[PDB]
Amino acid sequence: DTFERTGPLMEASSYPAWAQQLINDCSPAKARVVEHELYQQMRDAKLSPQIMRQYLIGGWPVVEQFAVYMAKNLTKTRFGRHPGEDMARRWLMRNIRVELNHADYWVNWCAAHDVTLEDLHDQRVAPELHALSHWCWQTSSSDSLAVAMAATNYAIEGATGEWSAVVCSTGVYAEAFAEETRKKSMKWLKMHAQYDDAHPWEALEIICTLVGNKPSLQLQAELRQAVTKSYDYMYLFLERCIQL
Amino acid sequence: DTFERTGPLMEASSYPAWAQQLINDCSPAKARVVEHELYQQMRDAKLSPQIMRQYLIGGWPVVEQFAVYMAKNLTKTRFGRHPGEDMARRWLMRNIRVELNHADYWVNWCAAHDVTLEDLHDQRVAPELHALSHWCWQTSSSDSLAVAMAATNYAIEGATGEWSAVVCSTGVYAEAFAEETRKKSMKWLKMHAQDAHPWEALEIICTLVGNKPSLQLQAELRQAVTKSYDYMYLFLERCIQL
Amino acid sequence: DTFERTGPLMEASSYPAWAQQLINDCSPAKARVVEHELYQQMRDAKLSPQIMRQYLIGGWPVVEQFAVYMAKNLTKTRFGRHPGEDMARRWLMRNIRVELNHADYWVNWCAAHDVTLEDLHDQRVAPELHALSHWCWQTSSSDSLAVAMAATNYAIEGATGEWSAVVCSTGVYAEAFAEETRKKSMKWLKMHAQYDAHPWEALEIICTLVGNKPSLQLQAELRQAVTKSYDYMYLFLERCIQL
Amino acid sequence: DTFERTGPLMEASSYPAWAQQLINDCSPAKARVVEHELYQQMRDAKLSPQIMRQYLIGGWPVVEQFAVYMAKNLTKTRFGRHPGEDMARRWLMRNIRVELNHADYWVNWCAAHDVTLEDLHDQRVAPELHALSHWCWQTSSSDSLAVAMAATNYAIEGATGEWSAVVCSTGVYAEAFAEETRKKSMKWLKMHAQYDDAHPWEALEIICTLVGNKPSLQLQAELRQAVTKSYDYMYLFLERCIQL
């Protein structure tokens, strides 16, 4: 049967029971990322420039290609075919524009840590760190619109908002930068920490409208595995950086 | 060598000599479309509802997928690789958002002529009319960024702006609609007549190819632009045959 | 419900009723192509070198990219997902190899009519003639495996076999070529006229994928895809003969 | 300038200096995979069924989609455009047919270790093991013909031939299976180990013909990074199975 949200957008209770189950099943994998030691050290301006460097260089591929993932998912949509598809169409068209200067913001954050655009092109980091980007590519290329959006717009942007909030929570990290260049350097983190917390809930609403209230157990497992894969690749990336 | 625009954006004289030559070479093919009898009849509210119906239904595939072409072209870009690529990246990201309600505007124009969304899905028109959309798909899928933009954002949107202006030029066509629904029905045409969009695309194409592109690339660019105009002309000829 | 062919491969009666209905519904569009004046003139070695030239140059894009259309279709398959998908997997992997020298054969046929490989690259022909290739591209890129194969492997290869047979039916066209270079020049036509199971295998794969009771909406897509391929062929022929 | 092979196909000395340099630079990464402890244990029929299970399930995605990677590469070719492109066109068309029963052979090997086709679909393994398949997808999708063949036909197949030979080298592993079903179970390994050791050399020749004798340092680095990434993801997969 068809899903239509009745309750408030940012309450798990407003979504179908299978979706609530998915949120609970994937919560430990999300926690591993959000509560990670790396972000706690970064927050407190105690994170080694060696780790910071690997983080900033390795993190670039997903940052650079985010709108390309979204553009690939948009090519899956058709007008007036399904209500979920029409929501996805509109939302992806709106949010591709939002990502406009995000790559430039990352380059600016990098510059504050003496990471050049040339460093971002060269990608002289452990291949392990590129796994998330390859996964984002494949899902947005070949998986269903719902599975693909669960993996990228829901899982990545959801976790990103939570850990960037952790990193900005004390103000210690920001105080470590010069007053004059602070705004420019902290821009990428401020956008993701001070951006509508509704964002992943909008994504989840679209996913549920696409799959409906009674999806197959096979589709449920595919959705659970896609979300978990994104969180797990994010955790493995963090673990690899902290190993240095 | 590298291209950098000096002169005003909407003057042919501001672009490399090969581009000016391309504009002159493709101008008769553009004229066949813009000066077409169909738009002159539509302008004067003298176009048969039979032709109008085929036009509205057949025209839907390019309208519906226009943002999908731009999305496909965006996937060809990478950050900080080339100045032309960085312009294309930004421009495509901005203009995908611009096409948000364009499909809804087309559905609204259709509704004024009793063409339903179901009619648009069914596509019970001559397959000839779908050729432009198939060309758009292929070029934006497999051709270089410059070539694909030359055929879509430059050729299609360029010609579209010119013929929609012709259609709106007298006010006769708008007066034919009911006062109550007039604004809603005329919206798609009004959005396209009211244009720097084709010129911005030329600038990107020129920054991508440079001042001295290969003769093979020049021919590919000329053929792509001509193919878009020619498919538009053949679409118009097919509609007027009914 | 699931489809399993019991009857002979090359009889319409061996397929589901909806498929038989599709064959009858698309037969007039196929006939326009196969029974076309161009092939009748070519068969009798009476076709103007001017038309022959446009034909050979314009026909190149679909010939050159036919295995690419298959390769794109193969990317839509997964192992052990569906019986129809497993048949498509195997069949496309086998038939991509079959198309190996087909482009070289076309270049050789072209040479006999003073059409160079440079001519094929330049594509100095009416843009109308490229419509089939653009359609093949889109359907093999974005349509479902069944719809895409119906438009390429079924409709194109099916019609191609029938009109190449018409062209070779008298022996007049072959006799027009020099004895010494005849075999090399006639190779592309020989490979499509003398080789007729390919479209049936494609029809079998399509019916196995969609089953015995496909939706009316899916049936209509299948019908439209097959008709579009035949109609673009017909328009290509009409454009050629106008010259 | 244009490359044309003069010397024997299976000698590094027959290829341009940059290609010889690439072979030497990627040899340690290839060695980590081929000389891996997992294959040595498997060869001697001493590998834990727990590890063997993860191996067989996790290895399935690249095996299942190998022909799809090649098919994607074939779509990048055009006839009579470049000599290297014409060689690639022919070679991919021939070798897609070769992969016909390879997935069925893997399913048969899996059956001998009580791994069902359902297990292969479910993929209830560590997400780390899927990284090679995601990389294979992305490269075959968005990288150049040369870079994607270097990563798949050259790197993956080249290493596969070498480690499958290691696994079959003693006969101990084969003797561990029942006489009656041995041929059916060992088929995937036997096909890869017995295959003309010249297949990656065929691929290396095409890559060299595509890029020429004087490719840019940027293209050389791209080729080196692609080959290394494939070997590294292979190594990480092996390390993950052996951890269990």
UniProtKB/TrEMBL annotation, chains A, D:
It comes from the Bacteria. It holds the Pfam family Haem_oxygenas_2. This is TenA family transcriptional regulator.
